[PDB]
């Protein structure tokens, strides 16, 4: 159905699985010569660049957290706490 931003009840924290999937996706993208939203401070590994993008919180992705009924909450990698 798609749950509104006010009314979102899932964790404000990013899941171990979310973080891994984001780093993977961005590494795969950077590696496919996608634009990088961070200064590569001499960086060359797309995974190492992905960590830097997630650290500077400059990853233009969104996690769609599906619920067992089918509904979902959308969360920006920007808004997700990284205590991981």
């Amino acid at each position: 159905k798609a749950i509104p931003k006010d009314q979102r009840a899932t964790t404000p924290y990013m899941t171990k699985y979310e973080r891994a999937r984001i780093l993977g996706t961005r590494a795969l993208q950077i590696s496919m010569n996608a634009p990088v939203f961070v200064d590569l401070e001499g960086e060359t590994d797309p995974l190492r660049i992905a960590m830097k993008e997630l650290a500077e919180k400059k990853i233009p992705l969104v996690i769609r957290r599906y619920l067992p009924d089918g509904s979902f909450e959308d969360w920006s990698v920007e808004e997700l706490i990284v205590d991981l």
Binding site: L28, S31, M32, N33, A34, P35
Partner: protein, 171 residues
Amino acid sequence: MFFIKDLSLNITLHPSFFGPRMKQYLKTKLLEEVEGSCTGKFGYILCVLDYDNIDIQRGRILPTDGSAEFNVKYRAVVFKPFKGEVVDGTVVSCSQHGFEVQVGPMKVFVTKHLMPQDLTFNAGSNPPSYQSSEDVITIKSRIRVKIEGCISQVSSIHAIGSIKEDYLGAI
């Protein structure tokens, strides 16, 4: 006829395009793929309306390749001809078999037999014409046709038409 229709193409963007000029490359890929297109289901997709308000939505990243898939929701001018539709057009082709009529994006071919009997072919004219006691149907001439049936054919739609009944024929 000539309708305005709400349609939605799915586009698949390669990661190297995830720059700020994204919505722009997308809106264009839609226009490349969709405008000029001819489908049986919707007819000729002619002109994509309201460029400024084309809906890109959030695009899902497909797991193994980094590409993202977007459902580009849009609105366009279409042309889906029907049997029984009365159309006006200009003649183009003309032979012993009949004459073809250009109607917007599509041609309609009128059979020698789908015309009144009085109209006879004339090979010895420039360009080859169809002659009646009153009328002379030829290349640049304007004609009102009734579409008898159409054939959905790849990048086009073609139809067989009549000028035999009342109020049809030369204009």
